[PDB]
């Protein structure tokens, strides 16, 4: 269950949109990144419960939309800017400075293992899919074969290397080989439900395990060789619990969701049970949720923008 362990108030006079936890740098140390529309800050632990701001980066014109975590990168922070759709992706680093990484009609973006960042733009025959690498500066850009169906989300497949998954506007799932750039397979998912947003994908025994969001989450099991979907697991709110899925995050085998309620709900994905509820503190509905990438914590944020950090065990 959930133990409130620390917290972060960020009276930034700007709407808070996202948070994430990463290791920074001459030594790995767990930090928290907060993003508001017009400012992004890096924070370190002041003591057992308090956080202090170490760096800040400012954005005028186009508002910050999300943080984009990149596994195995500790010397910069990537963010996506845009009012609704993504227009730019920037890298923030230190004395604070920033670099424009990509610019245009961006539809989807995902940080990948080993310092890569994948993104896609356009919609059809115009679609491009690109994976860049950081050393770290703009080093390589490999195109991937586009499915010419708008990509809605990426997910790196846990349990293999070099497999990348996408979902498309067509309710299709695509798999690429990250090494060759090849599009290996396209597979339609029952025309609903339906999703659209893949939170996590796993490979085990030649089967694909795919977590989507609606029943608050769905696990679809697909045989990649036949293309056929082989079963489906449901994650549902307990006996009495109002609320529909609104957004969420999955780390390893845990899933968190912000419900239309305003409550956050948690599942262990192995077992399928809702392992905790977390009502809004005060009257402030939870605005975003993210698992910590450095440790065993759940980050829950309000537009306020106060962040509450819980210990999961």
């Amino acid at each position: 269950n959930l133990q409130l362990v620390s917290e972060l108030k960020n009276p930034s006079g700007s709407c808070s949109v996202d948070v994430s936890a990463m290791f920074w740098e001459g030594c790995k140390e767990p930090c928290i990144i907060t993003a508001c529309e017009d400012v992004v800050s890096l924070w370190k632990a002041l003591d057992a419960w308090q956080w202090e701001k170490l760096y800040t980066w400012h954005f005028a014109e186009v508002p910050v939309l999300q943080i984009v975590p990149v596994p195995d990168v500790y010397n910069l922070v990537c963010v996506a800017l845009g009012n609704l759709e993504i227009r730019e992706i920037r890298a923030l680093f230190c004395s604070e400075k920033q670099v424009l990484l990509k610019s245009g009609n961006i539809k989807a973006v995902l940080g990948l293992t080993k310092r890569r960042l994948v993104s896609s733009s356009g919609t059809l025959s115009d679609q491009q899919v690109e994976v860049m690498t950081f050393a770290g500066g703009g080093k390589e850009n490999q195109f991937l074969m586009p499915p010419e169906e708008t990509i809605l989300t990426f997910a790196e497949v846990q349990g293999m290397q070099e497999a990348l998954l996408g979902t498309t506007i067509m309710n299709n799932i695509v798999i690429w080989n990250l090494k060759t750039g090849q599009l290996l397979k396209k597979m339609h998912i029952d025309d609903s439900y339906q999703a659209s947003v893949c939170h996590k994908a796993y490979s085990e025994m030649g089967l694909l395990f795919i977590v989507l969001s609606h029943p608050v989450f769905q696990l679809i099991v697909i045989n990649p060789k036949t293309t056929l979907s082989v079963g489906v697991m449901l994650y549902c709110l307990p006996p009495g619990q109002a609320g529909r899925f609104l957004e969420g995050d999955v780390k390893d085998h845990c899933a968190a969701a912000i419900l239309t309620s305003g409550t956050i709900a948690i599942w262990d994905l192995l077992l399928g049970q809702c392992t905790a509820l977390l009502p809004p503190v005060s009257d402030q509905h939870w605005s975003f949720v993210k698992w910590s990438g450095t440790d065993s914590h759940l980050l829950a944020g309000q537009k306020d923008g106060n962040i509450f950090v819980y210990h999961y065990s």
Partner: peptide, 14 residues
């Protein structure tokens, strides 16, 4: 009888 292939990935990559 939907066959499962534990090597589907390198297979298609080949």
């Amino acid at each position: 009888l939907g066959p499962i292939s534990l090597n589907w990935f390198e297979e298609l990559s080949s």
